[PDB]
């Protein structure tokens, strides 16, 4: 014969932000032709995996 | 409790159908 | 905004059954000219619905 039996399981949840005002982005994209938004967005993801 | 008898298996919900709110109005624009 | 609620259901069951013999089956043949199994088959079949 046979028999049966159950489990079950449930996940939790993260957040993560960054700030930069207009000016700053203007002067570090005339000079060393960086970008904020690109930079900030990958150091988030980034991130979230490593504490993770 | 065994598998050989219609109890032994356990049971699994089916989502079958879902309500919605009614459609709410009157009519009273004649006066 | 919003609410939610939920509700249930579920089947039941039936069962029905006949016999007869071989001798009885041969007899009612030869002496009326008529078939056993399928008399008892009909009835089964038509008593289920009405009962139901």
Known sequence: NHEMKKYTLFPSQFVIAAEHTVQAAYEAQREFGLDLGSLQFRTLKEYLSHEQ | ?31
Do not use: N
């Open chain 2, 1 to 31: 409790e065994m598998m050989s008898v219609s109890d032994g298996v356990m049971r699994l919900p089916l989502f079958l159908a879902m309500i919605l709110p009614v459609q709410l109005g009157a009519a009273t624009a004649d006066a």
